[PDB]
Write a protein that binds this DNA or RNA. Structure first.
Ligand SMILES: [Zn+2]
Length: 636
RNA sequence: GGAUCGAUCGAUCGUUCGCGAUCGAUCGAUCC
């Protein structure tokens, strides 16, 4: 049974104009979209049929929307199906669209089809319902659909142009500082969705006040540790590793020019990966000791990165998890690495391991952040013993660390590990949500509850304060835009989307000139010859592979831990560099149609030209420019 | 494998305020 709040939300898009309907609850969002769909299909006279498309960006929400739509739009003689990645293989999407009314297709499918050629005009549909439409920022699938829509609208060939009603919960803030910029951002979002009304509950505010789901803020600024003996030991090990790495690279400080570096920080990680990317371009003409020196610096730099991550984990999470993480890394890479460089580094680590284990088991070196975390958890749990809480950490190296700390803490017994009969649900990003804890993690909260923010920096505190200020500013700007009439808003959005179309069509890249030289690829940590670009074939303008049989013996197969097909191939195993001690992540082994193909990634490669002898480095395939010969199945 | 979004950090230019802007790196999440 619809209520007055539903009808007040659904009022402006009822008349036949595009809206930015924003309801916070998910059930309310589903209900307003359902009512809009029902009255859009009911208002059509005989002989004409609607083709409403509902866009869902997530697979579980696609399942949920398809379920509710097929449960409600079932007795009315309406045909409803849906498309996804595991459904759209060799299936005539044109036949579905021409013979369905309430397709609940995901947006990437429509982008792929519009780029392919199928479904040429966007006027086939009549009602586009975007779920969580605030994601339309730049180059998104929603924004690609809107690009094609605006291309169709502003090209002078406007036909039965479908409604593009957007549905959300928060209209979004962007990076606003003052109300003019927030108003400009809201107008830009509205014009990108091409709507002139923003539906928002105003006359039935107590309907939302009945169920609002808003928490209170409970900032707890904490102090870091002071007796950082372990940080001293790991810093000494860092200094030793870097000094012995400097024996083979005299100018190691000069490859990266940023600033002075300090251990246990993200800046050190950036310096580590920059100097990692720096030394894989060496041009020593021996080509045999070049492999060993490149392997040596890769091993040293990967070790330094691992110690830096261990330092970060020890700074944030508890001690023993950081030590066990380092021991696990040394166990997994020791089981693969058997050279004397690994022998030296590993023997240095076990030489320090006795001191590390002695300093790890000291209760006097407990982190105060976890101390007052369990202290606030204990007071609130003694206040309420049926409360399920959710804790957010920034990194996946900490979600298991906090779970281990929960399991190994004897001061608490009511908690259960909830890695995402489950008391506390430890997760990293995203039910009842009766308690939310943000441990050193800055992000979104709007997605008798409480929100305890724990941090060792006041930057997060001032960031959240200006986040509340920008939320208030966005609400005021929304009310100001709702004050306006239909005309001036319409030519304002028309001018700004004309400007957006101008810059979008102006910012077009030409075709890169393909080189006429046969440049080749080499492994990252090994610098051995992998394959020339003349034997590289591109499948669907995104994936690349090698068709030579000499390449087939250059790698080895390792079974994939998480294999899953994506609409074109199916994944069987990863390919690794088959050398003495390389074991580097080259790519992945799939089947496209019948053949087995090892599709590779240029991220873990270094490309050199046979003529000039320079080893340049690329990170993604689009930046790499060469004669992309298409893959022909007639060869092999 | 490929593309996309979000958060942190760093480099470069323009104005000595608050900063604005192209590029880059790490971590997390989604879809194909
Ligand atoms: Zn290799």
């Amino acid at each position: 049974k619809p209520r007055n709040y539903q009808l007040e939300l659904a009022l402006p898009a009822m008349k036949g104009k595009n809206t930015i309907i924003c309801a916070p609850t998910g059930c309310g969002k589903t209900f307003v979209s359902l009512l809009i769909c029902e009255h859009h299909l009911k208002k059509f006279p005989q002989g004409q049929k609607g083709k409403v498309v509902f866009f869902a960006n997530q697979i579980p929400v696609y399942e949920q929307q398809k379920s509710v739509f097929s449960k409600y739009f079932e007795r009315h003689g309406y045909r409803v199906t849906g498309i996804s990645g595991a459904t759209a293989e060799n299936v005539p999407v044109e036949q579905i669209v021409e013979n369905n009314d309430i397709i609940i297709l995901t947006p990437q499918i429509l982008v792929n089809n519009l780029k392919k050629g199928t479904i040429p005009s966007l006027s086939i549909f009549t009602l586009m319902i975007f779920d969580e439409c605030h994601n339309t920022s730049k180059q998104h699938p929603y924004n690609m659909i809107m690009f094609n829509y605006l291309d169709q609208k502003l090209g002078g060939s406007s036909g039965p142009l479908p409604q593009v009603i957007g549905l959300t919960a928060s209209v979004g803030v962007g990076d606003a500082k003052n109300t003019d910029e927030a108003l400009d951002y809201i107008c830009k979002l509205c014009a990108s969705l091409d709507a002139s009304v923003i539906a928002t509950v105003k006359h039935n505010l107590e309907e939302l006040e009945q169920v609002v789901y808003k928490p209170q803020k409970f900032f707890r600024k904490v102090e870091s540790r002071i007796s950082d003996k372990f940080k001293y030991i790991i810093a000494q090990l860092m200094r030793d590793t870097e000094s012995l790495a400097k024996r083979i690279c005299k100018d190691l400080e000069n490859l990266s020019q940023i600033q002075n570096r300090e251990f246990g920080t993200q800046k050190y990680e950036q310096w580590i990966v920059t100097v990692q990317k720096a030394c894989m371009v060496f041009q020593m003409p021996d080509k045999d000791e070049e492999s060993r020196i490149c392997k040596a610096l890769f091993l040293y730099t990967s070790h330094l990165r691992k110690y830096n991550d261990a330092l970060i984990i020890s700074e944030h999470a508890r001690m023993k998890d950081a030590l066990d993480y380092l021991k696990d890394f040394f166990s997994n890479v020791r089981a693969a690495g058997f050279d004397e460089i690994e022998q030296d580094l590993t023997q240095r680590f076990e030489e320090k391991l006795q001191e590390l284990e002695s300093v790890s088991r000291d209760p006097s070196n407990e982190n105060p952040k976890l101390e007052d975390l369990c202290f606030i958890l204990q007071e609130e749990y003694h206040l309420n013993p049926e409360t399920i809480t959710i804790l957010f950490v920034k990194t996946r190296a900490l979600v298991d660390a906090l779970k281990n700390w929960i399991e190994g803490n004897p001061k608490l017994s009511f908690l259960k590990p909830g890695i995402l009969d489950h008391n506390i649900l430890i997760a990293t990003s995203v039910a009842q949500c009766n308690l939310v804890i943000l441990y050193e993690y800055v992000g979104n909260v709007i997605k008798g509850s409480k929100c305890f923010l724990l941090t060792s920096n006041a930057g997060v505190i001032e960031k959240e304060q200006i986040n509340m200020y920008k939320e208030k500013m966005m609400n005021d700007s929304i009310l100001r835009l709702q004050t306006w009439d239909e005309a001036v808003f319409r030519e304002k959005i028309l001018h700004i989307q004309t400007h957006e179309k101008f810059i979008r069509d102006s910012q077009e890249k030409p075709k890169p000139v393909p080189d006429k030289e046969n440049k080749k690829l080499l492994c990252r940590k090994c610098k051995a010859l992998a394959c020339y670009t003349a034997d590289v074939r591109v499948i669907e303008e995104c994936h690349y592979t090698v068709l030579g049989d000499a390449f087939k013996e250059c790698f080895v197969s390792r079974p994939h831990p998480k294999p899953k097909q994506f609409s074109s191939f199916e994944k069987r195993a990863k390919i690794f560099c088959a050398r003495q001690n390389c074991s580097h992540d080259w790519g992945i082994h799939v089947k496209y149609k019948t053949f087995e193909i090892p599709v590779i990634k240029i991220e873990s490669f270094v490309v050199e030209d046979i003529a000039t002898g320079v080893q340049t480095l690329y990170s993604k395939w689009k930046d790499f420019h060469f004669e992309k010969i298409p893959f022909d199945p007639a060869e092999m």
